[PDB]
Amino acid sequence: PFYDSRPPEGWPRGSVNDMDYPLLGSICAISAIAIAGSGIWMLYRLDLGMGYSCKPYKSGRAPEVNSISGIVCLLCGTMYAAKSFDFFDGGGTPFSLNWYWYLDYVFTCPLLIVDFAFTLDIPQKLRYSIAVFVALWCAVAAFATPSAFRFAYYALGCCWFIPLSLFLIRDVKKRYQVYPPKCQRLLFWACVVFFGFWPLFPLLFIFSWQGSGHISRQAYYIIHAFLDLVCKSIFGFLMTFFRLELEEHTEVQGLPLKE
Amino acid sequence: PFYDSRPPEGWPRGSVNDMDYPLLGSICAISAIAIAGSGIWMLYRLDLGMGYSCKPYKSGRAPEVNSISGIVCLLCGTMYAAKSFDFFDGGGTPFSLNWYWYLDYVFTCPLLIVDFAFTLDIPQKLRYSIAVFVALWCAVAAFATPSAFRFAYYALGCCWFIPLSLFLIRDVKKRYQVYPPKCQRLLFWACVVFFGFWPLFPLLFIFSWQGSGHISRQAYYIIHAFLDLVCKSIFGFLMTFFRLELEEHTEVQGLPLKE
Amino acid sequence: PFYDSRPPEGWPRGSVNDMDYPLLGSICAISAIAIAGSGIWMLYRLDLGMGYSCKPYKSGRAPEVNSISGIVCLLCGTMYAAKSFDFFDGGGTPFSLNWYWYLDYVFTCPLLIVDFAFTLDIPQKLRYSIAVFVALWCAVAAFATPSAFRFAYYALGCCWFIPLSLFLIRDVKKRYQVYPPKCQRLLFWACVVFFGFWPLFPLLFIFSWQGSGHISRQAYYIIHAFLDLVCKSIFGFLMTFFRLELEEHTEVQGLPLKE
Ligand SMILES: *C/C=C(C)/C=C/C=C(C)/C=C/C1=C(C)CCCC1(C)C
Ligand SMILES: *C/C=C(C)/C=C/C=C(C)/C=C/C1=C(C)CCCC1(C)C
Ligand SMILES: *C/C=C(C)/C=C/C=C(C)/C=C/C1=C(C)CCCC1(C)C
Ligand SMILES: CCCCCCCCCCCCCCCC(=O)O
Ligand SMILES: CCCCCCCCCCCCCCCC(=O)O
Ligand SMILES: CCCCCCCCCCCCCCCC(=O)O
C-alpha cells in the first residue's frame, strides 16, 4: 500500500486483514502456474502455423494481434505470482497487487476485449477498449471509497459497462452468421464467458463488504482466482481454437466466409 | 490523496482546503453532463456517414481515429463526475481527481493533439503526442513541488511546450492552404482554441498559489471547468464539423484538395 | 515519495539518505544535457533525408518509428533534469524520480527494444516490448521489497528477462546475414550494448544494498548515469547510423539486402 503497513506484531485478530495467508498464497501460486502455463502453450502453438494443418505463414511470421491471448495469460500469471509473494509475506507488503481491488485489471481487461474484437472483426476497437478501461477505473474507485459515494462510482461504472455489453451483443449477433459451424460453436462459448461471467463481477460487489456484507475478503480472493482462470485462461483457449478453426476453413481449405 | 485525508472534524477554517464544496460539486456535475453529452453526440454523428449528405462508408465502418474527439469528451465528462463525487463528499476523499493538479490531463491532452494531427494530416504524430504528455507531467510536478524548484519544473515544462507550439504553428501554416474555405474557417477557430487557450494554463500558474498568489484554489477549479469546456468540448465540435465539411467536399462532391 | 519525506532538520547522519546531494545533482544535470542534446541531434538528422546523401523522402516525411531513438533520449534527458532538481533540493522531494528504483525505466526500456526491433525487422514486436515492461516492473518490486521476497521478485524478473534475451539473440542471428558489412559493424556494437550492458543491471543488484551490500546508493546513482548514457544515448547513435547506412545502400544506391 501507499500508506498502510502490516504492524510488526501482525494484523490485530478479527481485523479485516486477519485472513488465512498461507491458504491464499497457495491458491495464488497454483493459479500463477496454470494461467502462465496456458499462455506459454498459446504462444508456442501460434508459431506452429495456420490451422490444424499448420500451414506456413506467407510472412514466415504470425500476426502480432494473435499474440494478445497468450500475452494476457502470461501477464495475469505473473501478477498471480506477485500476489502469492505478498500473501506468503503476510499481506500489506509495500508492493502489493492484493491491496487495491481491481487495480491489476486496469491493464488486462482492455486487452481481452481487443483480442475478442480482432478475432471476430468487430468494428470500433478503440471505442470498446477505452470503455472497458474506464469501467475498470470505476471499479477501483468503488472499492477504494468508504462512503455512500461508493454507490455513485458503481453507477458511473455501470454507465460504461452496460452500454458496452449491449453494443457488443449487437455486434456479435452481426458476425455470428458469417462463420462456419465449428467456429459458431466456439464463439457461443466465448459469449458465455463474456456475457455470462463478466456481469458476475458487478454482481458480487452487491454482496461484498462494500454492499450487503455477505462475502468476506478472503472468499473474494478465492472467487477471483477462479474467475481469472475462466476469463483469462479458458477465454484464451477459446480464442486460440476459434482462430485455428477459422484458418483451417479459409486458409487451409480456401473456403469463403458467409459474409 | 496518497497520504493526506480530511480530518473527521472537517478541514480547519481558513486552511487551504476550506472551500465551498457544494458549489464546486454542482459545477463539476453540470460540466460532467455537458462534456459527456457532447461526446455522445459526436460518436452518434460519426456513425451516420460521411459529410452532411451522410454517404455510407465503403467499409460500412467509420475510421477508428475519428472516434478520438468523442472519446476524449466521454473521458473528460466521466472524470468530472468523479470530481463532483469527491467535492460533494467534502474533498480529500481517497480516490480524488481533484487533489493532484493536472494529473488527470496526462491522459486526455495527448489525445487532443493526436486528434488534431490526424484531422489535419500534420506529420510526426508520435513526436507531438509525447511532447504534450511530457509537458503535462512537468505541470503535475510544478503543482506538487512546494520549494523554489517549482519554477525549475515550470521552465522544464516550457522547454517542451513552447517548442511544440511553434512547430505546430509552422505545420498548420503548411496545411491551411490545402483546404477549401469552409474548412479554412473551422480550422481558424480550432487554432484560436489551441494557440489561444492552451497558453492560458501556464499563464494562470504565475498568478496561482504557486506564483503571485492572486488566484485561489476554489477559483482555479471553476476556471478549469470552463477551460475544459472549451478545450475538450468546443474543440471536439470544431474537429467534427471540420471533417464533415472536408468529406462533403472530397467524398460527397469528389473535389480535390489544393495540396 | 508517497509516504516518506525529508525531515526539516535534514536526514540523520549515516542514515541511508545521507548522500552527497550537490555531487549527485551535478552529475544528473550534465547527464540531462548530454542525453537530451543527443536526442535533439537525432531528430534533427532524421528530418534531413535518407542516408548520408540526404535523399528526400517520397512522403516528404520521415517514418514515425524512426523518431523513437531520438524521443527516448529526449525523455531520458528530461527525467535526468527532474532527478537533478530532486537532488539539489536535498532528496526525498514529493515528486522524486530518484526514490523508487527503476520506476522511471518502465516507460523507456520497452521503447528501446521496440526501436531495435523496427530497425532490424525483428518479428513479434508486441511480445518483446511487453516482456521488457514486465521485467522492469519486477525490478521495481525487487527494490521496493525489504524482505527475503525481494529474491522472489528477482527470480520472477529473470523468468522474463533471460527468455527474452535468448530469443532476441536468436532473432538477431537470423537478421545479421541479411545486411551489408557497414551495417553488420554497427549491429555488432548495438549487440554489445544490449547483450553486454543490459545484463549488468541484474548483476549489480547482487552487490547492491538488496544483496551483498558492497555498493552504496550514492554509487548506484552514479553508475546508472553512466549506464543510461550508454544504453540510451550511444545506443541511439548506433540505431541512427545503422539506418543511415542501410538507406545509403538500399535507397540511395538501390542495392538489395541478402535476405
Ligand atoms: C479478468 C477480469 C475481468 C474481466 C474483470 C471485470 C470486471 C468488471 C466487469 C467490473 C465491473 C464493475 C464492478 C466490479 C463494480 C463497479 C461497476 C462495474 C460494472 C464497472
Ligand atoms: C484539456 C486541458 C489542457 C489542454 C491543458 C493544458 C495544460 C498546459 C498547456 C499546461 C502547461 C504548463 C503548466 C500549467 C505549468 C508548467 C509548464 C507548462 C507549460 C507545461
Ligand atoms: C535504460 C535502462 C535499462 C536498459 C535498464 C534495464 C534494466 C534491467 C535489465 C533490469 C533487470 C532486472 C533487475 C535490475 C532486477 C530484477 C530482475 C531483472 C532481470 C528484471
Ligand atoms: C456523466 C458521465 C457519463 C458516462 C458516459 C458513458 C459512455 C459509455 C458508453 C460507450 C460504450 C460503447 C462502446 C462501443 C460502442 C460501439 O462501438 O458502437
Ligand atoms: C534538459 C531537457 C531538455 C528538454 C528537451 C525539449 C525537447 C522538446 C521539443 C520537441 C517538441 C517538438 C514536437 C514536434 C516537432 C516536429 O514534429 O517537427
Ligand atoms: C509464473 C510466471 C511465469 C512467467 C512467464 C515468463 C514468460 C516470459 C518469456 C517470454 C519472452 C519472449 C519474448 C519474445 C519471444 C519471441 O518473440 O519469440
Numbering used by the authors:
A (entry chain A), B (entry chain A), C (entry chain A): 2 to 260
Paper excerpt:
In HcKCR2, the N-terminal P2 is surrounded by P95, F96, W100, and Y101 with no space for the first methionine, consistent with its predicted post-translational cleavage. The overall structures of HcKCR1 and 2 are almost identical with only minor differences in the N-terminal region, ICLs, and ECLs. HcKCR1 and 2 exhibit different spectral properties; λmax of HcKCR1 and 2 are 521 nm and 486 nm, respectively. Despite similarity in retinal binding pockets, these differ at positions 136 and 140 near the β-ionone ring of the retinal, offering an opportunity to investigate spectral mechanisms. While 6-s-trans-retinal is found in all reported structures of naturally occurring microbial rhodopsins, during the structural refinement of HcKCR2 with 6-s-trans-retinal (STAR Methods), we observed a steric clash between the C17 atom of retinal and the methyl group of A140, along with extra density next to the C18 atom (top). Modeling 6-s-cis-retinal resolved this issue (bottom), indicating that these two residues (A136/A140 in HcKCR2) create a steric clash with the C17 atom and simultaneously make space to accommodate the C16 atom to induce the rotation of the β-ion-one ring. The ~220° rotation of the ring shrinks the π-conjugated system of retinal and thereby induces a ~35 nm spectral shift. Swapping these two residues between HcKCR1 and HcKCR2 confirmed their influence on the orientation of the β-ionone ring and largely explained the spectral difference. HcKCR2 thus represents the initial naturally occurring microbial rhodopsin with experimentally demonstrated 6-s-cis-retinal configuration. Two residues (T136/G140 in HcKCR1 and A136/A140 in HcKCR2) are involved in the conversion, and considering a previous study with the C1C2 chimera, G-to-A-replacement at position 140 could be sufficient for the conversion, while position 136 may fine-tune the twist.
